[PDB]
């Protein structure tokens, strides 16, 4: 009933524990973490998006809308025949599909406009496969 | 806040709902029509509450209606969906999680009133399950002492409470049904069928009936599932008024099997076991349920054919280890000969349970593995075969 | 880093929208988001950041909260009584 998990498997890179451990000297160096180059967003200012790009509810094109059923059969069937143990998981059931449905409508509303893109759709069947397939690290 | 007596016409719509042909079909897909396919699987739903009629007889009897059909198959099939809205449809319904319902949950709870500050007896969960239909979770997961309770309300139909201070036999006369999650999770193809279940056989086999849930992977299936999922999106089927024919139908309809439909239930029966009375306990349950439909006060002749039919659709899950003849029979034939052969050359009675595996299991696909040699070995045990001459070594039986 | 974990961090705290079939069941309408590895690899500082932000904001643990802890309990009122 889980439609997505992040492993967070933890293998050492010289050359990004470095890189992370700069960060780690970059504090306690100073309080002011980001540069190099970035402004985030204060709360205040980027949760009034929140709820103001949760007033639009996109409506699905049926144009993206059959092409999600069609990578489905297809994540039906590569996830199926997956088969036994090893990687997994299947089976892929629709509840799953049902969320990456609803993905695509989360996904539209920070692109608001409730057009529901393919891209918006297949951007998050990107973070299908990238939520697991990182146990091969 | 925010007896039902229905009005005369709509009664009649219920006569005319019943002159229509695909009652027995269409009032299905209203069954659950947010549901998609798996009609079979609400046929059973279908007929359920509609399930049995009471027999008390001169005295005793009292088989009733009551019919309780265990759910299984694929997991998220949206077979959780079917009770939580079959929930709403009962006008006495259960339901309840697996292990966060308990057999004390089940009937008797007798807690201090705290406020009286003096324990109060408390009906539980099977005695408020009495009466109407109840839905099971992780029937699977249950607890051992769970299942117990219900197989005293599967025969007696009743819960016997002598716990604590007072004793009370209480009845719990009520329609149950179980989702079941397979340990697969997938059931896997072949396989034992019972044995995939899991559970004890004693408990499977005393089950109504069991629909077994499965994906074919159609193409040509999910894609118009997913384009009915494919339903909201945006934006012949009566909703209500079933429902007051659920009440209708149950003491307004006394329905009577007759000579005829007795005739056609023998034979199939006889193909059956070539099954149980159990099963044959069902068929006579199943039909007359079918006779609840209809207004009719007496069965009709054509319809224990699916009745038996709805049986051999759980039959045909069983075409995918106990009940194939030997198994652990040849097994404990080798064993013993084993030990007696190692029993005349050995200088001992008796060999290491580790030369046990090495002299069983290794050499064919017949022998078991260890465990299962140690099942052979214990069952041999209570035969006096053998002498377990302690954990370290095996010892046969002596003179 | 951790930026991809966090692309989709961004959905959840948005989520949506739901539905209405009429039926009448509603489908979340809500993401429902685990992370799996160990050591901690500070993974809950990510809670920390993510339920500050967010309204209704509810940061827990195991134990933590109980399942009492998560649904009303009946307990005695200290003062003013009482039971509620």
Do not use: W
């Amino acid at each position: 009933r889980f439609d997505i998990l992040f492993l967070m498997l933890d293998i050492p890179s010289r050359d990004d524990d470095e890189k992370l451990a700069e960060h780690v000297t970059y504090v306690h160096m100073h309080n002011k973490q980001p540069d190099l180059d970035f402004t985030p967003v204060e709360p205040s200012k980027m949760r009034e998006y929140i709820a103001y790009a949760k007033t639009k509810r996109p409506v699905m094109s049926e144009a993206v809308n059959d092409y999600v059923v069609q990578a489905y059969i297809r994540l039906r069937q590569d996830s199926k025949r997956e088969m036994d143990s090893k990687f997994s998981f299947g089976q892929a059931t629709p509840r799953t599909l049902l969320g990456i449905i609803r993905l695509s409508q989360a996904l539209a509303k920070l692109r608001l406009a409730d057009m529901v893109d393919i891209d918006d759709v297949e951007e998050a069947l990107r973070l299908v496969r990238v939520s697991k397939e990182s146990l091969y690290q | 806040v925010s007896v039902r007596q229905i009005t005369d016409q709509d009664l009649a719509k219920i006569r005319e709902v019943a002159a229509r042909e695909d009652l027995y079909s269409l009032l299905a897909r209203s069954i659950a029509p947010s549901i998609y396919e798996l009609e079979d699987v609400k046929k059973g739903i279908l007929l359920q509450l509609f399930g049995g009629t009471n027999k008390t007889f001169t005295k005793g009897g009292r088989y009733r209606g009551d019919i309780n059909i265990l759910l299984c198959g694929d997991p998220s099939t949206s077979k959780s969906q079917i009770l939580q809205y079959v929930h709403k449809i009962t006008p006495r319904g259960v339901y309840t999680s697996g292990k966060g319902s308990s057999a004390v949950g089940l009937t008797a709870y007798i807690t201090r009133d705290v406020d009286t500050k003096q324990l109060v007896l408390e009906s539980g969960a099977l005695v408020l399950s009495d009466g109407g239909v109840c839905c099971i979770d992780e029937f699977d997961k249950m607890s051992d002492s769970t299942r117990s309770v219900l197989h005293e309300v599967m025969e007696q139909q009743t819960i016997s409470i002598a716990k604590a201070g007072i004793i009370t036999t209480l009845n719990a006369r009520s329609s149950i049904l179980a989702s079941a999650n397979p340990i697969g999770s997938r059931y896997n193809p072949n396989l034992p069928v019972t044995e995939n279940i899991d559970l004890p056989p004693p408990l499977l086999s005393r089950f109504d009936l069991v629909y077994l849930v499965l994906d074919k992977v159609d193409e040509k299936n999910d894609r118009e599932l997913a384009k009915h999922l494919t339903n909201l999106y945006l934006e012949v089927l009566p909703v209500e008024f079933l429902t007051m024919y659920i009440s209708y139908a149950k003491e307004h309809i006394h329905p009577i099997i007759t000579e005829a439909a007795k005739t056609e239930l023998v034979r199939a029966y006889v193909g059956m076991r070539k099954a149980t009375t159990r099963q044959l306990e069902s068929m006579i349950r199943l039909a007359e349920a079918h006779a609840k439909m209809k207004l009719k006060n007496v069965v009709e002749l054509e319809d224990v054919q699916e009745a038996v039919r709805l049986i051999r659709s759980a039959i045909k899950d069983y075409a995918t280890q106990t009940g194939k003849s030997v198994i652990q029979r040849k097994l404990q034939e080798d064993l013993s000969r084993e030990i007696m052969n190692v029993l005349k050359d050995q200088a001992s009675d008796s060999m290491s349970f580790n030369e046990l595996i090495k002299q069983i299991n290794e050499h064919s696909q017949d022998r078991v593995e260890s465990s299962d040699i140690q099942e052979a070995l214990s069952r041999l045990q209570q035969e006096d075969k053998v002498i377990v001459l302690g954990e370290g070594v095996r010892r046969s039986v002596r003179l | 880093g951790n930026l991809d974990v966090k692309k989709a961090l961004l959905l959840l705290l948005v989520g949506g929208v739901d539905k209405r079939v009429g039926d009448g069941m509603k489908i979340r309408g809500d993401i429902n988001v685990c992370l799996m590895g160990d050591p901690g690899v500070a993974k809950s500082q990510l809670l920390k950041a993510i339920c500050k932000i967010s309204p209704r904001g509810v940061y827990t643990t195991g134990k933590g909260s109980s399942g009492v802890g998560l649904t009303a309990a009946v307990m005695k009122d200290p003062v003013t009584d009482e039971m509620i």
